[PDB]
Amino acid sequence: AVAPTAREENVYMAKLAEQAERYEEMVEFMEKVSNSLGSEELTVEERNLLSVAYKNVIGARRASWRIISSIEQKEESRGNEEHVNSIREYRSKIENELSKICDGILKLLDAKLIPSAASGDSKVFYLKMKGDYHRYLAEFKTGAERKEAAESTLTAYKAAQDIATTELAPTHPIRLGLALNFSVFYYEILNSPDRACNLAKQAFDEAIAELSYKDSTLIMQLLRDNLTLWTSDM
Amino acid sequence: APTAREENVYMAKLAEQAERYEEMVEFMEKVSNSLGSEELTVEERNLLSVAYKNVIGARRASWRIISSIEQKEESRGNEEHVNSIREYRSKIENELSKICDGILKLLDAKLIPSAASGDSKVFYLKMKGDYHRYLAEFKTGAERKEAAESTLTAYKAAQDIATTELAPTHPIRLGLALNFSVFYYEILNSPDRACNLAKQAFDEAIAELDTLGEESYKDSTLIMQLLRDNLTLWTSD
Amino acid sequence: FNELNQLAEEAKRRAEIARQRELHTLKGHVESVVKLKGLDIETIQQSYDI
Amino acid sequence: TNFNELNQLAEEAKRRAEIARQRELHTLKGHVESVVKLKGLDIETIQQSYDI
Ligand SMILES: C=CC(C)(C)OC[C@H]1O[C@H](O[C@@H]2C3=C([C@H](C)COC(C)=O)C[C@H](O)[C@]3(C)/C=C3/[C@@H](COC)CC[C@H]3[C@@H](C)[C@H]2O)[C@H](O)[C@@H](OC(C)=O)[C@@H]1O
Ligand SMILES: C=CC(C)(C)OC[C@H]1O[C@H](O[C@@H]2C3=C([C@H](C)COC(C)=O)C[C@H](O)[C@]3(C)/C=C3/[C@@H](COC)CC[C@H]3[C@@H](C)[C@H]2O)[C@H](O)[C@@H](OC(C)=O)[C@@H]1O
Numbered sequence: 327a328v329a330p331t332a333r334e335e336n337v338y339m340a341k342l343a344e345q346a347e348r349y350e351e352m353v354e355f356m357e358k359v360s361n362s363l364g365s366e367e368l369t370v371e372e373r374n375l376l377s378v379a380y381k382n383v384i385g386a387r388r389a390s391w392r393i394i395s396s397i398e399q400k401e402e403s404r405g406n407e408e409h410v411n412s413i414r415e416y417r418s419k420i421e422n423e424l425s426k427i428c429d430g431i432l433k434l435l436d437a438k439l440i441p442s443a444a445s446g447d448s449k450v451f452y453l454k455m456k457g458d459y460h461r462y463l464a465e466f467k468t469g470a471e472r473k474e475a476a477e478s479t480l481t482a483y484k485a486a487q488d489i490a491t492t493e494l495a496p497t498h499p500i501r502l503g504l505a506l507n508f509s510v511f512y513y514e515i516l517n518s519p520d521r522a523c524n525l526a527k528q529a530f531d532e533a534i535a536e537l538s539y540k541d542s543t544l545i546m547q548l549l550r551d552n553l554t555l556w557t558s559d560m
Numbered sequence: 561a562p563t564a565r566e567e568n569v570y571m572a573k574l575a576e577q578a579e580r581y582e583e584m585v586e587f588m589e590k591v592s593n594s595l596g597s598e599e600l601t602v603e604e605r606n607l608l609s610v611a612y613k614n615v616i617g618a619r620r621a622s623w624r625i626i627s628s629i630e631q632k633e634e635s636r637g638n639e640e641h642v643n644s645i646r647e648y649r650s651k652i653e654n655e656l657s658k659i660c661d662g663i664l665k666l667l668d669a670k671l672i673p674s675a676a677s678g679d680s681k682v683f684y685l686k687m688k689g690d691y692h693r694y695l696a697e698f699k700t701g702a703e704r705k706e707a708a709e710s711t712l713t714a715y716k717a718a719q720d721i722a723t724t725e726l727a728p729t730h731p732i733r734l735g736l737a738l739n740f741s742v743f744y745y746e747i748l749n750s751p752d753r754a755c756n757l758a759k760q761a762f763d764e765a766i767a768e769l770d771t772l773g774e775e776s777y778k779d780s781t782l783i784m785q786l787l788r789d790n791l792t793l794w795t796s797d
Numbered sequence: 798f799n800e801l802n803q804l805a806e807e808a809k810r811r812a813e814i815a816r817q818r819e820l821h822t823l824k825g826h827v828e829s830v831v832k833l834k835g836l837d838i839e840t841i842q843q844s845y846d847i
Numbered sequence: 848t849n850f851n852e853l854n855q856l857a858e859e860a861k862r863r864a865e866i867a868r869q870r871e872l873h874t875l876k877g878h879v880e881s882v883v884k885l886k887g888l889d890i891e892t893i894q895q896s897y898d899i
Contacts (some may be wrong), residue, residue, distance in 0.1 A: 346622040389879050390578035396890035503899045510898045548897040621827050628838045742846045786845040800848050
């Protein structure tokens with residue numbers, strides 16, 4: 327049997343891991359794929375797998391964090407100081423993991439993924455990633471640590487948008503996905519809902535004006551969903 | 561000023577809701593090591609079982625997904641992928657081993673011995689068959705024989721005690737009936753023993769609807785319909 | 798309106814049956830995952846355990 | 848109650864189910880909301896937007 331190369335076995339194992347809900351392994355596998363490439367470009371499929379792997383791994387911690395915060399809100403209501411401190415002790419351990427994960431991918435993005443990026447596409451992809459993980463930090467960091475994080479997010483999304491907006495069609499899944507997240511950053515991190523509605527609505531409008539499909543249409547549905555949520559809430 | 565036990569139990573409940581089940585196990589294990597002659601309360605009991613159920617459940621899920629893929633690939637002649645998938649099934653099989661064994665030795669050293677009432681004893685006997693059953697699901701040949709033997713021994717014990725000491729409507733009794741019947745179906749491949757066992761446990765529960773209980777009733781009611789679900793599927797061949 | 802709400806109620810109840818199976822059984826959980834992910838995979842032989 | 852009408856209601860519910868599936872699969876908010884539904888968590892709705 328001809329031994330599979332490191333690249334091909336670990337791309338396949340990432341795909342098994344994803345189907346199997348073994349997302350920490352999926353990261354392990356995609357990092358092995360990344361090492362077999364040095365600073366050469368990942369394919370579309372390879373980078374999508376890598377993004378999905380970190381998306382899920384951090385997602386799980388984002389979800390845990392949101393749930394625990396709601397339990398803590400209810401308990402701040404019900405005046406249960408003892409429970410509130412336990413939840414707080416615990417939300418912390420969660421925040422350490424989020425930190426650690428974020429630092430991991432951010433380091434890979436700065437050292438390998440972003441300078442590898444040839445086409446605008448790929449450059450938008452990676453700078454979006456870099457925006458997102460700084461945003462995830464911003465979600466829970468306090469005053470100065472938040473500002474640093476918000477600062478790093480803006481500068482990545484602004485750099486992505488300046489490429490996407492001039493190099494990619496309004497209908498491009500990555501332009502679309504960037505506007506989604508950039509708009510969210512404004513709504514949730516900066517708390518500027520007018521700025522958020524403006525950006526989201528513009529990306530949606532430019533895209534609508536231009537009418538492959540499947541991913542674009544999903545992200546456009548999400549833009550619309552967000553816009554309708556943010557308005558009924560004004 | 562809450563105790564270290566009380567604190568860990570609250571911690572377990574947080575972890576369950578956050579879906580952080582490995583930590584849930586950790587917290588529940590730190591509880592069952594600190595206890596002496598006392599057995600665990602009903603709540604603690606449940607927290608523990610759920611934690612191991614979920615930690616292990618994630619892997620059983622993984623195992624079945626992967627197996628399904630192996631069969632789609634094997635019927636395509638992708639030797640190459642069938643290797644990777646087998647390599648990977650094996651890595652999971654390992655995890656199932658180590659988890660099953662952590663809990664199985666706890667059951668044997670602490671939890672089972674300290675079980676004083678029927679309730680308590682059935683609850684752990686059931687758990688003992690359960691994790692032997694998880695081994696049987698993926699083990700092969702010799703090791704599977706042992707697993708299957710161990711399973712039958714532990715369930716059959718639990719059932720005699722349940723049949724004499726627990727109400728037929730009692731969720732612990734019903735739960736056993738459910739898993740024991742699954743055991744015969746999925747591991748022993750005896751659909752008639754599976755159905756006979758299930759239908760019986762179901763029918764005794766119905767014969768005694770007088771004994772559904774203020775808190776008991778939703779749990780026992782769910783399990784009853786799970787037995788009916790299995791039966792319904794097993795009967796239609 | 799009349800037949801439609803009776804329609805939704807039946808749906809809601811079946812949802813509730815699905816929800817319990819997904820929460821407390823391996824089968825339910827596996828099935829959700831296969832549906833959610835849209836895995837093109839042969840139906841697995843499963844029974845309910847707790 | 849008319850077939851064509853029932854058939855269309857089925858198609859519309861199926862179209863929306865399919866979007867609901869993609870949200871739950873691909874978004875933090877979809878995922879989080881389903882986890883609270885599944886568990887039946889006694890918590891008050893978490894404020895969330897969709898990100899990808
Ligand atoms: C599961 C397998 C993997 C490899 C992960 O693929 C997931 C998905 O990968 C691609 O889709 C991307 C993509 C997603 C799509 C929106 C999913 O589309 C549908 C219809 O389900 C969600 C993913 O996270 C992914 C990979 C990520 C991004 C995101 C990246 O930020 C750095 C920005 C937008 C979006 C882009 C890259 C999408 O093109 C494909 O276009 C999708 O398939 C098609 C053609 O419909 C496939 O479902
Ligand atoms: C998951 C949430 C936590 C907090 C852990 O509670 C688990 C659950 O714990 C109790 O229910 C038990 C129980 C389960 C019930 C059948 C769930 O029923 C309903 C309607 O919620 C499933 C669980 O795995 C658990 C704890 C386990 C067993 C199992 C033990 O084998 C060793 C065999 C029978 C079954 C018994 C012990 C059930 O009584 C409770 O009575 C349930 O509350 C309700 C609705 O009645 C609660 O959701």
